[PDB]
Symmetry: none
Subunit: 109 residues, 3 copies
Amino acid sequence: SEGLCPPGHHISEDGRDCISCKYGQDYSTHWNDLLFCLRCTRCDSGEVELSPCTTTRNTVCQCEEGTFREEDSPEMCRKCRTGCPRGMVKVGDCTPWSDIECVHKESGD
Amino acid sequence: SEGLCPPGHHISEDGRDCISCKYGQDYSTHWNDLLFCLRCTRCDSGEVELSPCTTTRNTVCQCEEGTFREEDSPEMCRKCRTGCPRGMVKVGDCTPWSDIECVHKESGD
Amino acid sequence: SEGLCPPGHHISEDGRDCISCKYGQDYSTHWNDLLFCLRCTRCDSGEVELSPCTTTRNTVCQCEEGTFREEDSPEMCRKCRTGCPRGMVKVGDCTPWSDIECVHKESGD
């Protein structure tokens, strides 16, 4: 369809005009259909930067191994399970965003 | 924006950012729009890894020779038959998933 | 004779032998038949171990005085109030698990 602007640029309401956005102000990752540019993400200590932010790129935030990010916490990472629940076993990997996996097999019938 | 992310990627809670997932830590097979990355599958002793997983692949498990596993019973392997009782003839190959094949012979007496 | 190992011991994949697990490295509360032993619980900086884990026991974590946390939270602790709002009274104690308690007008005459 029409009314779309390439990355780093945005299109007006009337769709007959597109304006350029400045490096570092705001960015667009995919063809945008708005008059504004999206805010760029920044990282803080305890987190690792994987990719740069630019009119054609987005900054990536990642958390250090051993910690996890749950939807119940804001830009925070928590220590993964330090021991599966009583009657379970270790089998899953912990990702800065997801938690470990525990499985029940031998513990009361 | 629609809010969809390609395979191997996830979208943060804010819906305006998409981040890459690490090989073996987790992946996505089909287009998704969540802050979660799909966990990778692991196999246990007695079973071998047929194909490791990546940001665009799923891990498969294998059973050692002499065992069998039908789609009707997962996470289970059973001893494959080495020869049908007298009267039957072995003619099929045994695969960690399927069992041998036996056919009745009219020849003889 | 059997395929079971007592608490504090794990068994090999072939079941022909069982290896002993030692306190502080891992433990088991009930009989089991696995290759690994149940992990011992450790606490992060700012938290203390209330009770260590032995070959037959599990370790509990505690948070330092002045901070508080509910069982519903992962393991974060918050600073208890050192003075109820203006026109309030102090009457409850703050425990790393519980928060301070404030009351209005102790008693009249």
